Amino acid sequence: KPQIPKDKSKVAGYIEIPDADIKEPVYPGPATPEQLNRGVSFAEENESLDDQNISIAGHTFIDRPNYQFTNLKAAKKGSMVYFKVGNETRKYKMTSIRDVKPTDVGVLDEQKGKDKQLTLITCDDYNEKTGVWEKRKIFVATEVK
């Protein structure tokens, strides 16, 4: 059974989006500037691998076209996404809900028996006063089969 290290400095898994040339170690959340400085990280601190929707955040840095989630937009509908943890490789396919601002959809873990999914979030301009990344783009991938 998967587990997210309590130690924020330890890699929890790997997220990969081949069509975007993304292969990144994933660290425990929440996705604060420090965590994203270590690497891509789960968006929330209480994130759990058994949830219907797992959220992972990454930086968007123009100075580096291929840094973390900067090139994520390169991945279109159908693109394979791999989420690897100690005991398993989960496979998902990018849906049409990609590269969209949260002000266009807005959804959380609100899912009864809906298929498992991953929400990849590009982040920029963190606001310390509110604990939120002002600039965000959402990408939703649903598990295969």
TrEMBL record:
<dbReference type="GO" id="GO:0004198">
    <property type="term" value="F:calcium-dependent cysteine-type endopeptidase activity"/>
</dbReference>
<dbReference type="GO" id="GO:0030145">
    <property type="term" value="F:manganese ion binding"/>
</dbReference>
<protein>
    <submittedName>
        <fullName>Sortase</fullName>
    </submittedName>
</protein>
<dbReference type="GO" id="GO:0042277">
    <property type="term" value="F:peptide binding"/>
</dbReference>
<dbReference type="GO" id="GO:0006508">
    <property type="term" value="P:proteolysis"/>
</dbReference>
<feature type="active site" description="Acyl-thioester intermediate">
    <location>
        <position position="123"/>
    </location>
</feature>
<dbReference type="GO" id="GO:0005509">
    <property type="term" value="F:calcium ion binding"/>
</dbReference>
<keyword id="KW-0788">Thiol protease</keyword>
<dbReference type="GO" id="GO:0000287">
    <property type="term" value="F:magnesium ion binding"/>
</dbReference>
<feature type="active site" description="Proton donor/acceptor">
    <location>
        <position position="59"/>
    </location>
</feature>
<keyword id="KW-0378">Hydrolase</keyword>
<keyword id="KW-0645">Protease</keyword>
